[PDB]
Write a protein that binds this ligand. Sequence first.
Ligand SMILES: Nc1ncnc2c1ncn2[C@@H]1O[C@H](COP(=O)(O)OP(=O)(O)O)[C@@H](O)[C@H]1O
Ligand SMILES: O=C(O)C1=C[C@@H](OP(=O)(O)O)[C@@H](O)[C@H](O)C1
Length: 168
Amino acid sequence: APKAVLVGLPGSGKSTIGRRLAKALGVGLLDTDVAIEQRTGRSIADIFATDGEQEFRRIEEDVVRAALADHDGVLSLGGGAVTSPGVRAALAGHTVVYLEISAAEGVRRTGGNTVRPLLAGPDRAEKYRALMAKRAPLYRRVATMRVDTNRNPGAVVRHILSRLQVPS
Ligand SMILES: Nc1ncnc2c1ncn2[C@@H]1O[C@H](COP(=O)(O)OP(=O)(O)O)[C@@H](O)[C@H]1O
Ligand SMILES: O=C(O)C1=C[C@@H](OP(=O)(O)O)[C@@H](O)[C@H](O)C1
């Protein structure tokens, strides 16, 4: 099972922190979005565009569940994976690091030309707020560790490592 599962909104630092945390723990990084792409042979964007969000979530849930069983490193979940009840259920018992970000910094971090089905213009800020407001309690319910990332990646990682190692 994963040493740590990373959850957070897009732009919260999953890929950055994941790479750095993985390195620090001497383990591999798996991103569930990449495994979805690997397994389906299809882009995340095409599944959304053609098949729709709900089929995406079921695929995503299956991939999350397998990864929770087969991956021994740091696992990062796509931002909406916690909207699925069965994903939250499967996360029970795991080490789950919620990377928290404010709207304004998250907006700022997600601004370039990455294709994002649920966060395209115009009005990305509005859309970011709606995703944050809706998902905050969902991230909170699965998290075993809340990490404010609004700090330096290196710092965030030292904090995570520390908190993985010692009693509450
Ligand atoms: N702890 C942090 N503080 C400030 N900026 C960060 C931090 N972690 C990541 N970033 C920045 O946020 C952007 C997106 O980070 P990323 O790791 O791709 O988030 P996610 O993978 O959750 O979408 C990048 O520009 C990255 O440099
Ligand atoms: O917010 C979401 O629901 C999504 C976030 C993406 O993952 P990241 O959070 O890694 O960008 C990806 O799974 C898809 O576009 C849906």
